[PDB]
Amino acid sequence: MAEIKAIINLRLLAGIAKPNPKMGQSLGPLGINMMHFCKDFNAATAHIRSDIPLRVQVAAKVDRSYSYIIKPPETSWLIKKVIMKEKLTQYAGHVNLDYIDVRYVYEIAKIKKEIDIDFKRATLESICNCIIGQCNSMGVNVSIIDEKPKPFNPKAKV
């Protein structure tokens, strides 16, 4: 019934949601129809490119009912696109080599705010300061760059 049995984080491509057996390990024992599920996902994400991986949450319930919720893509993946690298530092703080400029941070924060339910109360300084601390853990810095990057499609586990 309406009581929440469990919560799961996932990662999905927008329009290529499909009953992959590598997601039935989580949603199998809960009796949820992967086919009927993925239908309602791809329906909403038709206004989004299909290459992109998003994430979603599922409040699986006691009667094996469900209520899916969509969130922006992984914040780390978005920066690997701009940074054009796939793998980041083992260490952090000691090994600082990567560089973005602010003028894209101001643009990728809007991604989080336009979609994510948690930041509806929040301002942009708030969101921008959240990733900088996430950047400290990764080997990333925020430095002015006049140039633009060129496209890259860093991996995702899906």
Binding site: R121, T123, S126
Partner: protein, 237 residues
């Protein structure tokens, strides 16, 4: 935080009081590490006798006291309550502050030197002090405390100040003596560190160094490293 973000945006300007205040304390302390506060402290007490043995006092929760004197002065040994003794520690200023003892009409200056506690039982055994007299040399401990400076260029980036000594032993010949020492290391560098004679040159006239305690004026306190990247680039290459 304690107020919603939507209200804080209206009152973001208010937080100047936060930062304008921290200017005041941390600057005040940073310049007042050196100076003794001008405030008299007094400790009523009683004389020693051969009757009052230790364990007799220690059920009464009193304490012995011991003073070592200086040139030509006799030693003095007294009795006092424990809670006086810990309260004397509980000041900032305990390492050097001048504390008096009123037995009767008499007063005896002193300093803190140390205390012994019975470690397995953990009660106060005695409280030991050192006499102070104005016109004669007197041992004191001047701790060193280093300020931060964003005015030098090597100190700011990838370098590390190294305080090899915490304090200095000296001899003072006058009433008011400085609590501690404060240093501004801008002119220092990897090439020259600070040495004790750079301090000996800059003190009041009533102070001198206790050479019996230190090794040599060419000894050095504050040392500065090189850069880290210049190591790190060489470390990898």
């Amino acid at each position: 935080t304690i107020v919603g973000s939507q209200f804080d945006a209206q009152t973001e300007h208010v937080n100047k009081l936060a930062l304008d205040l921290a200017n005041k304390k941390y600057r005040k302390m940073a310049l007042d590490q050196a100076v003794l506060r001008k405030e008299k402290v007094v400790v009523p007490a009683e004389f020693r006798t051969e009757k009052d043995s230790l364990i007799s006092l220690k059920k009464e929760l009193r304490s012995p006291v011991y003073i070592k004197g200086h040139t030509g002065i006799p030693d003095v040994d007294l009795i006092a309550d424990n809670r006086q003794v810990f309260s004397i520690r509980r000041r900032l200023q305990f390492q050097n502050q001048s504390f008096y003892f009123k037995v009767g009409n008499e007063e005896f200056r002193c300093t803190y030197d140390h205390i012994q506690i019975h470690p397995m039982e953990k009660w106060l055994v005695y409280s030991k002090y050192r006499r102070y007299v104005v016109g004669k040399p007197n041992s004191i401990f001047l701790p060193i405390n280093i300020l931060p400076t964003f005015q030098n260029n090597a100190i700011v980036r990838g370098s590390e100040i190294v305080q090899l000594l915490d304090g200095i032993w000296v001899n003072s010949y006058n009433d008011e003596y400085p609590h501690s020492i404060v240093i501004d290391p801008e002119n220092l560098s990897k090439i020259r560190p600070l040495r004790i004679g750079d301090i000996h040159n800059f003190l009041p006239d009533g102070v001198e160094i206790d050479k019996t305690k230190c090794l040599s004026l060419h000894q050095k306190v504050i040392k500065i490293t090189g850069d880290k990247e210049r190591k790190l680039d060489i470390a990898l290459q």
